[PDB]
Amino acid sequence: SMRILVTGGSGLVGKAIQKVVADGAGEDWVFVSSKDADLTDTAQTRALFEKVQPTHVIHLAAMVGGLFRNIKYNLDFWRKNVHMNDNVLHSAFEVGARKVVSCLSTCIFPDKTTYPIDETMIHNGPPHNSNFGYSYAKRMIDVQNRAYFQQYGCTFTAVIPTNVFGPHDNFNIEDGHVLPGLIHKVHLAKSSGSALTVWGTGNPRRQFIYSLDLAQLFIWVLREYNEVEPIILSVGEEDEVSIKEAAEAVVEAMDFHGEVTFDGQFKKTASNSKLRTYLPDFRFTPFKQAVKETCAWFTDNYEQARK
Amino acid sequence: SMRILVTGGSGLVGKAIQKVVADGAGEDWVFVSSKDADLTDTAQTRALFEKVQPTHVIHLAAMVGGLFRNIKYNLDFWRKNVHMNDNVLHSAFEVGARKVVSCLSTCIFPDKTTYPIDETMIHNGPPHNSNFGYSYAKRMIDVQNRAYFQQYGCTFTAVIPTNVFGPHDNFNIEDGHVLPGLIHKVHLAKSSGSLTVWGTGNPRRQFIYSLDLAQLFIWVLREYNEVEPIILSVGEEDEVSIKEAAEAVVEAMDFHGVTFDTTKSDQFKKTASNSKLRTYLPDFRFTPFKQAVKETCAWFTDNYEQARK
Ligand SMILES: NC(=O)C1=CN([C@@H]2O[C@H](COP(=O)(O)OP(=O)(O)OC[C@H]3O[C@@H](n4cnc5c(N)ncnc54)[C@H](OP(=O)(O)O)[C@@H]3O)[C@@H](O)[C@H]2O)C=CC1
Ligand SMILES: NC(=O)C1=CN([C@@H]2O[C@H](COP(=O)(O)OP(=O)(O)OC[C@H]3O[C@@H](n4cnc5c(N)ncnc54)[C@H](OP(=O)(O)O)[C@@H]3O)[C@@H](O)[C@H]2O)C=CC1
């Protein structure tokens, strides 16, 4: 008998976890996504934890977005995220939560670094200075986790997904998630003429993880896995696709037949061999099928979707 | 014209700034803190800042002490310090403060590094794991300064003193501040038969006398407008071994009874570069090490009862 509290249950990763149907199955699952509780307010946050009395917490909530927009607000990404993370982790502690699993991103790793990055390298140099406020707030999560563990022996971890995509993503072209950016562009291009890309070489490579797959692995991390050192959740370091190959998959999936044309990292390779030490028999949804499914979702949910 | 708020005004560094008398002078120096306001509390911190309406802030206050003890509290050191820093920096942001200067110690720098360290190396690798909590919280002040600058154009900064000593230090032997602990050990020595000190005596350290530091702080507040921090330290050409620090203290206090106790702690170097201060202040001169020790030994004996021991 456990009650799982999911912060940011209404975003890309949260909506994916809300299935779970099929079925998660045991567990009382509580999804929150708010207001309902502004995790930036300590009063509202402790109140939220006092009401529901989580035994387990999956922490997805974060101040994100604008993040890939060129005008930066590094004080805001820093202050807002640090408050939320402290509020959430420490409220969890105070009501006696047994486990908290938070979420970091690969873009917070040292800008320098040799590839592939692994879970031990997160603090080994300063992040890229673009979004340093966001990057250091996320890094501090690992720092909080290790502190809780040192002083009270609590088990609080984090997962490190690569680039997540899927239904309920941010499809707003301006704020720059590249995959859902592509889906939206192709959709605009069909009902007009010519069109593409999201501009650039198309050469840069990313590891993409389908939100539905991430949801599976996240429920496993919650149920099992008790390191405090984070775990990279991602497809193999040889299953990256270039942006060009991502556009080719979207164009294929949406049956777009117009012109493409082109004119960032250029790679952030992450190893998933810790994951492979635990789950060697787990298989990711093929990229092309995952793209095709999130394309179909976009077209059948155009009115409801984020931009 | 210029109202100046100093948190941690009752600490070693703060007490030294309160002179000034001597004479700083234009100004208006508001020495507070003393947890007459608990800087851990957003409400009280705000109220204090709304009450006094500073244009400048020397943020000295921090959660230290117990820091060098054997049993570690990284969660507390992290949370409390992060809260203080945020509270202070942002409350000062909200009252429209023209400038903020904070303090980092060299403790927080990467455990694995080349020497000498300079201002651009603070984030180049993880601090020693003993006190990661305190170390990362200090580092985040730098992150915080850059954020106010980038997003608002404000000039918040930090100075990085090497090992500060002087009047009003923590002379407690368990809170193992090396130099105050020597001074205090020699005193419990004379007041009986015979040391210690702990370790081999070989490790080298850069010490700065509080009153030297007080005068650079004032300057940094008045001049200095970079968000990149500034190391406040004597040169690398200087630097004294723990043995030489014990000797100077032995002389100063006329002790005649030593031994080292191979067994205890011991990095063996934390060498910081002062190039940037030497560029701004080529003619500034520190008080000599031997005199400064004597002067603080004297203050210690003259103020025993009312000292942190
Ligand atoms: N998407 C990606 O590519 C990657 C994401 N991650 C991490 O995964 C997590 C999930 O991201 P994702 O699902 O993509 O993000 P989304 O932006 O899609 O979802 C954001 C969630 O955060 C919540 N939230 C934001 N601000 C607050 C607040 N003040 N109080 C309460 N809730 C708030 C939102 O709730 P509301 O709707 O109520 O605003 C929403 O549920 C994030 O923490 C992210 O950093 C990690 C690696 C890659
Ligand atoms: N060698 C050194 O000593 C070095 C120090 N530094 C940094 O420089 C600063 C100077 O430290 P120093 O003066 O030596 O240390 P002290 O311990 O003497 O000073 C502590 C000061 O902080 C105040 N304080 C502590 N907790 C709180 C709180 N919750 N609210 C308000 N005030 C609080 C204390 O006030 P009260 O008396 O009321 O508790 C006291 O005024 C420190 O921040 C340190 O990190 C950097 C490099 C070297």
Side-chain angles (χ1 to χ4, degrees), chain A residues 72-76 78-79 83 86 90 123-126 129 132 136 140 143-144 146-148 150-151, chain B residues 72-76 78-79 83 86 90 123 125-126 129 132 136 140 143-144 146-148 150-151:
Chain A
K72 307 300 195 173
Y73 293 96
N74 277 103
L75 210 225
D76 293 343
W78 195 73
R79 290 192 82 248
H83 292 184
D86 190 50
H90 211 249
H123 301 280
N124 285 357
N129 202 237
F132 71 91
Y136 278 117
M140 287 314 103
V143 167
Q144 281 157 276
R146 285 157 53 197
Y148 285 101
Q150 175 279 120
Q151 179 169 337
Chain B
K72 295 307 168 166
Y73 298 100
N74 281 111
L75 200 281
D76 287 337
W78 197 78
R79 294 197 72 243
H83 290 173
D86 191 45
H90 209 255
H123 301 287
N129 206 241
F132 67 94
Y136 281 113
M140 291 311 113
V143 169
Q144 282 201 308
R146 292 148 61 182
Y148 290 102
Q150 183 262 282
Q151 177 171 338

Side-chain angles (χ1 to χ4, degrees), chain A residues 111-127:
Chain A
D111 188 38
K112 63 229 88 308
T113 197
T114 74
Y115 292 102
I117 65 166
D118 69 34
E119 292 98 342
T120 66
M121 305 178 197
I122 115 101
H123 301 280
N124 285 357

Side-chain angles (χ1 to χ4, degrees), chain A residues 98-118:
Chain A
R98 177 200 320 176
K99 193 192 287 189
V100 181
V101 191
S102 293
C103 198
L104 329 183
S105 62
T106 58
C107 77
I108 82 190
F109 277 68
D111 188 38
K112 63 229 88 308
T113 197
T114 74
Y115 292 102
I117 65 166
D118 69 34

Side-chain angles (χ1 to χ4, degrees), chain A residues 8 10-13 33-34 38-39 60 62 103-104 134 138 162 306:
Chain A
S10 67
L12 169 58
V13 170
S33 270
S34 329
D38 179 350
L39 279 358
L60 308 172
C103 198
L104 329 183
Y134 171 87
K138 285 292 188 160
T162 47
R306 346 234 299 267

Side-chain angles (χ1 to χ4, degrees), chain B residues 7-14 32-40 59-64 84 103-106 134 138 159-165 168-170 177 308:
Chain B
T7 68
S10 70
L12 163 74
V13 171
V32 74
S33 187
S34 204
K35 46 169 51 200
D36 88 34
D38 183 346
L39 269 15
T40 261
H59 180 218
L60 304 178
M63 235 262 90
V64 299
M84 295 189 31
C103 305
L104 324 180
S105 63
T106 67
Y134 169 86
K138 282 301 205 177
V159 307
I160 311 176
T162 46
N163 204 122
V164 199
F165 70 103
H168 305 285
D169 211 318
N170 192 4
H177 292 61
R308 25 216 301 239

